[PDB]
Design an enzyme around this catalytic site. Structure first.
Site, PDB file in Angstrom:
ATOM      1  N   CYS A  58     -58.857  19.913 -32.713  1.00 25.62           N
ATOM      2  CA  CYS A  58     -58.060  20.202 -31.183  1.00 25.62           C
ATOM      3  C   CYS A  58     -58.687  20.672 -30.098  1.00 25.62           C
ATOM      4  CB  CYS A  58     -56.732  20.690 -31.578  1.00 25.62           C
ATOM      5  SG  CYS A  58     -55.635  20.469 -30.241  1.00 25.62           S
TER       6      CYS A  58
ATOM      7  N   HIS B 215     -55.186  17.647 -36.046  1.00 30.35           N
ATOM      8  CA  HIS B 215     -55.668  18.673 -36.811  1.00 30.35           C
ATOM      9  C   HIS B 215     -55.642  18.143 -38.144  1.00 30.35           C
ATOM     10  CE1 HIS B 215     -54.946  22.482 -34.635  1.00 30.35           C
ATOM     11  NE2 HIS B 215     -54.156  21.535 -33.592  1.00 30.35           N
TER      12      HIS B 215
ATOM     13  N   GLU C 131     -56.363  19.344 -41.149  1.00 31.18           N
ATOM     14  CA  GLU C 131     -55.962  20.387 -42.064  1.00 31.18           C
ATOM     15  C   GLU C 131     -54.510  20.121 -42.508  1.00 31.18           C
ATOM     16  OE1 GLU C 131     -56.557  20.823 -38.875  1.00 31.18           O
ATOM     17  OE2 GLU C 131     -55.786  22.924 -38.131  1.00 31.18           O
TER      18      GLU C 131
END
Ligand SMILES: Nc1ccn([C@@H]2O[C@H](COP(=O)(O)OP(=O)(O)OP(=O)(O)O)[C@@H](O)[C@H]2O)c(=O)n1
Ligand SMILES: Nc1ccn([C@@H]2O[C@H](COP(=O)(O)OP(=O)(O)OP(=O)(O)O)[C@@H](O)[C@H]2O)c(=O)n1
Ligand SMILES: Nc1ccn([C@@H]2O[C@H](COP(=O)(O)OP(=O)(O)OP(=O)(O)O)[C@@H](O)[C@H]2O)c(=O)n1
Ligand SMILES: Nc1ccn([C@@H]2O[C@H](COP(=O)(O)OP(=O)(O)OP(=O)(O)O)[C@@H](O)[C@H]2O)c(=O)n1
Ligand SMILES: Nc1ccn([C@@H]2O[C@H](COP(=O)(O)OP(=O)(O)OP(=O)(O)O)[C@@H](O)[C@H]2O)c(=O)n1
Ligand SMILES: Nc1ccn([C@@H]2O[C@H](COP(=O)(O)OP(=O)(O)OP(=O)(O)O)[C@@H](O)[C@H]2O)c(=O)n1
EC number: 6.3.4.2
Lengths: 561, 561, 561
Positions: B404, B524, B526
């Site tokens: 990001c 993102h 993750e």
């Protein structure tokens, strides 16, 4: 400021409100400015959604909010105008903190039941306790806080946290608590243990009672007081007892004779309120006037019988304000009140074949009564019988009061019998169109609005009871009014509309010309009846039922010379 | 359906989530379809108001809601896509019942915490437990319900009521409870009494534990298990113990070796789920693959050092998903993970005079690391140091991932050093206008959106890790994108945007042409890393830091042949 | 073995014993061998120190221990001989563990309330439950355990621990609990909350109720049963209700008609007791005989009035066994019992000037009654009036029974009026010497001892009621007997001592020759009266008061043909 919690018990329904406003009526005996807050554990934000069948009558404020019914018990006992904020509820406070959560007023912290919501409750109590509810614009000196539910409910747990923290945000010697608790009598013995287990519950959540007050079937035995005080942090002289008494208006004298205030004076150190001589005098005068209305109940020689005719009168809490307005007035007339409860539908000509026995009981009550009262019912069902009850008092000179739907039915009846017009009905029967007796006026009309007497009506019995004052101010709850097109016909036939609104378009009062007492009001006058100042339309109904109306107007029954 | 509560303790922070999703990971070993609900006692409706400084990272769903951070621990352990409804909160359920109160869905009854709100909580749990969160569209067979807070909190009291009533709305032999509790060790002795007092609390509210699970500093002594089981309604074989283990991914093997499931199989009578042979096989395969990734942690010979560079890295929960995404990938590479935490502002040329000591510690970490990671920070503060960390990995061939704000800073740096353009900055520095590196795109862009590879980029290291699939699907949280006007200049200079959106207007991935591993993602990644399927941009960062990236792409590290 | 606890409530005095032995009377309907233990929270080891003014009558065993008064309620309901060990008390069990502490039976360990004293209580309950209290020497099949006090008392805390551990030392499906709880009615509504708070208390200490049984002023409403069962782990069919009934002997039929046993049969799996056909038959016969004595109370057409004349009759529990012995016999005679309570001292010629009004009330009762009863009072005070009551029934042919001090006073009166001898008195007036009517015999004489009829007395009304059996066995509590020197003079004048002891020295029964019914007993026959087998000296008193004595002896009133 000073504060008094009223809370407690092993049961809901133990007696709190009479121990609450009654304690607040005695704070006013000291001359104090007084206010009250009722904390409700239920999740409704207001009574506006709550149908009058459960939780009872939607009591209405000066500010026109549909509050908790119990708030009314504090506007009679203290003589105060409360607001929509004086009824804290679990739904109201979760909504207020959740609004601040989405507005982001918590600066992106996580928001928790402790400390954020328990701070919100304290910040609400001390906010509302500033508001000048009393007969002059100064902030109150004592606030009575009634905690609904029972301590140890999973519904009341946020409030006993907030009140515990409030014992420190406010000081000791500014906050005190009265805990109301059960002494059941079984096998003819007063058992203390439910008070021990509920005081164990109370100290667990961290409040400590400065008084205990018992619901009991009896006078507490001397050993029962000792065995409660051996188990709680109170002297034996602070185990108060609200036993059976001649009427509910005696309870503040019972509390005062049990030396309840002679403790609160010291426990809240009330010498620290710098009262002016006018307040100290007006305190003693309010006690003298209370002893007078109380004496007028004991010294009551003769009965007045009133038929209250409406929908579902079995649900007696649904008419609570109406009953209290008749009680306040009956103590001015020195006469014992006997309300006959009539289901309006049992008067109907159809009920005679359907359920004949109850139909005769209903008609005996209507035929016996010294006055008739149509109480401002909910919905259409009772209407046909309420017409025949209004006819019964129009023709035979029985005293009458119509409230809201009662004015509507006084006008439907006078139309249906004096003008002929047998097809006429409420605007509720919408598709008849041409014969609708009423018109829609949504603005619902609510709250305290003025009403002005029509300037020629010097003959009026009702505008005499109002002391010849030019206007009155009253609570409303109506979506319909009498159709203005017809009102000249009704005025010309003698159903004179003696009071109207600011515009002169709206039908606010009627009086039938040359009848002993036949009144109706579009407003609900029972939402401003007070124990020392009874609501005038209800005072006239009792006084004319007693046959004494002239002498009440002339002043033979005011409390002090 | 079947259900498992996880609850309890004398303290918050005792270990619930690892005992929860870990118990749910073992339900999947049996082949079961599995789901999870986290009940939060806090009053926020969602994490969208909650700043990442307290309560930590706003975890993001497939459905793009900003949930409780803990939900992520269940999307890694089980391999499920949850929804905004799987995070019950006290603010969410008071709002839902208060909405129904003003809509009038209670038919004018008063609405109460019991039974109406405790019915709402049960009706929510059984509603959400139908939703097919799993790898085929059939409803789940077990739901793991984690009750946050502690039993006996005034914040958790509504939920232990609702769950008690739920033990009857659902049957016994369909519902079971695991209670997690403290065995403090003082003077070298394991004390049982906090478990006795918290189990006394639990049975008071009416839940009964089918297991107890202890937080303890030690292996529980044989007498400690006996002195808990002599005080609770459990056999000594159901006092489970989550003791110190080599890593958190071992806990489901610890629970299984403590025979935890060999009881739940009987206690929930799980022979009654009619599993197909495909489910039974996929259950055993998931256990084998768990034993493999667990073995790859014990059998881990060599370290990989990664500098994670961002704002306020002291607040380590604020990067929780990023850490777990690096852990899942590091077990595929068989290499031990060593995250160096760098405050981005300590890299700045200004920090050298202001706070010299910490500036050298920060630069030693950046200089030591085998890979650099810019993690998608919050706000502007860290930017100037994060530029110098991106420059350090552009010039010297260090492996890099930007997430990001890390893609934003990979592009600001490549602009600021390869194109010259030293004045260029984020669109956050609004009044510079002409030199803004980014443009506003509010649509905030959220939730699972696709991303499509640019059809020529066959050379790409990252699109090789994605298995040569035509598109990917990923979570987003951005209000800015790289200004499309500049993207041809960046593509021509070699900062090739290897992935874009459906329109081709939006910058979703970059790879720097002819560097060993220099990736950034606007999304993102993750928020979709799983323990058996690591998120590909993070797998590439670890594998290139290990110098093994080629062989991971070629398949030398898949779990089963 | 099987076991049933009876416990509970928010108040002492709620109704346990009638729910206890009454539940045990129905276990015998199933044919079961049955026993009972009363656990008392008080610290007296036995009633031998307890004066009859508080805690009431010192009930006396077959084994001659002065027990808790309540044990008697179990020897009537079940038809069992209990022992001094069946009354567990807090003083008894602390003494037993403290004895083992100084003997050193704990092998020099420290001895603790848990586990050592809670083991002692379990080891006592399972010890005593072996003892064969029943009509054949086999060990009981069910034990009814009544826990006195209330759960949550600091006096009852050791026993709820011991009983919790006992739910495991004994199995589930061998142990069950009945919790007795309060439904107060106020404002005409049954409130459930004291049952919720006391069940919260119960589950805290870890017992779970298999039934709830309510003390209520009413039949429980259908919603009250539902709102208790929604808050406790019982079906709505196990909220039992001991409401108002025609007499206390109906309660086991009320419990059986509320399907109370049709649950306990399944909940204790009582098909697992291998009963012989003789036991199964004797079970059904005991129920038939209970329906007969119960029918004889409903079908009771005519009253029998009995004056019970003694010291301090205001303290009505002090004569409890005497009342129950008159009730058991009155159901055999089909006649309604009306005990007139007379204070013996109000009969005195001195009372006429001291307290004239009560003296006339006392003498009206004596003059009205169809029978006189002198009940075996405590101490000397009442004696002078009890003489005049015995004279009244000697001269005028009123039926009479003297018990203990009543035989003493039957003999003092017959001496004082038939032999002249106006100075004669009890041996209590020690310094008169020559005129003492009695002699000391300390051996106090206690417990079950035989008594043998004098072999010529075939005329006797009392030895006819005993079925012409050669001897009887009875309980005693006396330190004085009639002086043997005088007995020939009394026998020759017609006060024939129709029964004596083994030696023939001791005066055990008298009958006055040629009177319709004038008996006295030195023993207390009310300590062996049973509901299906009434104590013969009391059966004769009622039957002769009814004028039916001949036909009762001839057999016109046995329960089955
Ligand atoms: N000053 C008061 C107080 C009470 N009441 C009446 O008494 C009943 C309710 O009494 P309350 O004091 O509120 O007791 P409960 O509500 O029964 O119980 P709680 O203590 O829970 O309020 C209602 O008729 C209420 O109108 C009244 O007329 N005037
Ligand atoms: N353990 C409980 C039970 C109920 N309530 C809520 O608090 C209110 C108290 O009302 P109450 O009069 O206690 O109703 P009942 O529970 O039925 O008690 P009762 O039997 O006396 O009506 C209930 O209506 C419900 O809103 C609660 O908070 N906690
Ligand atoms: N499957 C899991 C479970 C937990 N954690 C991590 O462990 C910490 C929180 O553990 P948790 O199980 O939630 O315990 P606490 O929150 O500390 O306590 P509680 O029992 O109250 O949840 C966080 O780093 C969380 O990310 C994790 O990485 N993976
Ligand atoms: N609920 C209980 C449990 C135990 N005890 C008694 O009080 C003592 C307290 O000792 P403690 O140290 O509490 O022993 P444990 O119960 O095992 O507690 P710990 O596990 O800390 O030893 C116990 O020995 C026992 O005598 C008690 O009164 N009440
Ligand atoms: N089978 C029984 C049971 C009780 N009673 C009488 O009822 C009263 C006591 O009743 P009990 O069942 O013991 O209730 P309480 O003692 O009042 O209360 P508890 O429940 O605490 O025992 C006494 O007169 C006792 O003799 C009786 O005559 N026969
Ligand atoms: N918190 C308490 C209070 C009393 N007791 C003891 O338990 C007995 C219970 O008797 P109870 O009937 O409760 O007497 P009171 O406490 O006065 O209760 P009540 O007011 O109903 O008599 C008391 O006599 C005393 O022995 C106890 O253990 N714990």
């Amino acid at each position: 400021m000073k504060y008094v919690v009223v809370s407690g018990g092993v049961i809901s329904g133990i007696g709190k409100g009479v121990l609450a406003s009654s304690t607040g009526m005695l704070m006013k005996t000291l001359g104090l400015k007084v206010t009250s807050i009722k904390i409700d554990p239920y999740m409704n934000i207001d009574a506006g959604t709550m149908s009058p069948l459960e939780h009872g009558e939607c009591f209405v404020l000066d500010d026109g909010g549909e509050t908790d019914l119990d708030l009314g018990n504090y506007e009679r006992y203290l003589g105060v105008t409360l607001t929509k904020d004086h009824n804290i509820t679990t739904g109201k406070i979760y909504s207020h903190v959740i609004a601040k959560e989405r507005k982001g007023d918590y600066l992106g912290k996580t928001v928790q039941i402790v400390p954020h919501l328990t701070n919100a409750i304290q910040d609400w109590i001390e906010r509302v306790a500033k508001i000048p509810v009393d007969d002059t614009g100064m902030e109150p000196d004592v606030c009575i806080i009634e905690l609904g539910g029972t301590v140890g409910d999973i519904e009341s747990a946020p409030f006993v946290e907030a009140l515990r923290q409030f014992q420190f945000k406010v000081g000791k010697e500014n906050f005190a608590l009265i805990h109301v608790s059960l002494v059941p009598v079984i096998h003819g013995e007063q058992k203390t243990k439910p008070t021990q287990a509920a005081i164990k519950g109370l100290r667990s959540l961290g409040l400590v009672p400065d008084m205990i007050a018992c619901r009991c079937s009896e006078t507490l035995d001397k050993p029962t007081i000792d065995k409660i005080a051996m188990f709680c942090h109170v002297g034996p002289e602070q185990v108060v007892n609200v036993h059976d008494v001649n009427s509910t208006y005696h309870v503040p004298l019972l509390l005062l004779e049990q030396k309840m205030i002679d403790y609160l004076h010291a426990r809240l150190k009330l010498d620290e309120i710098s009262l002016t001589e006018e307040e100290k005098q007006r305190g003693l005068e309010l006690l003298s006037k209370w002893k007078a209305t109380t004496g007028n109940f004991d010294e009551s020689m003769e009965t007045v019988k009133i038929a209250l005719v409406g929908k579902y009168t079995n649900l007696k809490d649904s008419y609570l304000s109406v009953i209290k307005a008749l009680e306040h007035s009956s103590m001015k007339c020195r006469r014992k009140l006997d309300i006959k409860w009539v289901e309006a539908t049992d008067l109907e000509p159809e009920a005679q074949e359907s359920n004949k026995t109850k139909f005769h009981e209903a008609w005996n009550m209507v035929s016996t009564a010294d006055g008739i009262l149509i109480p401002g019912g909910f919905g259409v069902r009772g209407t046909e019988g309420m017409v025949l009850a209004a006819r019964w008092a129009r023709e035979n000179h029985i005293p009458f009061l119509g409230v809201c739907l009662g004015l509507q039915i006084a006008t439907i009846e006078f139309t249906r019998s004096v003008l002929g017009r047998k097809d006429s009905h409420s605007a509720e029967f919408y598709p008849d169109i041409d014969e609708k007796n009423h018109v829609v006026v949504f603005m619902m009309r609510l709250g305290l609005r003025p009403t002005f007497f029509q300037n020629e009506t010097e003959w009026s019995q009702i505008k005499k009871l109002y002391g010849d004052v030019s206007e009155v101010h009253e609570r409303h709850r109506h979506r319909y009014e009498i159709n203005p097109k017809m009102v000249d016909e009704l005025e010309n036939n003698g159903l004179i509309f003696v009071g109207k609104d600011d515009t002169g378009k709206r039908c606010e009062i009627l009086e039938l010309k040359n009848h002993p007492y036949y009144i109706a009001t579009q407003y609900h006058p029972e939402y401003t009846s007070k124990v020392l100042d009874p609501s005038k339309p209800f005072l006239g109904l009792v006084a004319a039922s007693a046959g004494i109306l002239q002498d009440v107007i002339e002043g033979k029954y005011d409390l002090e010379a």
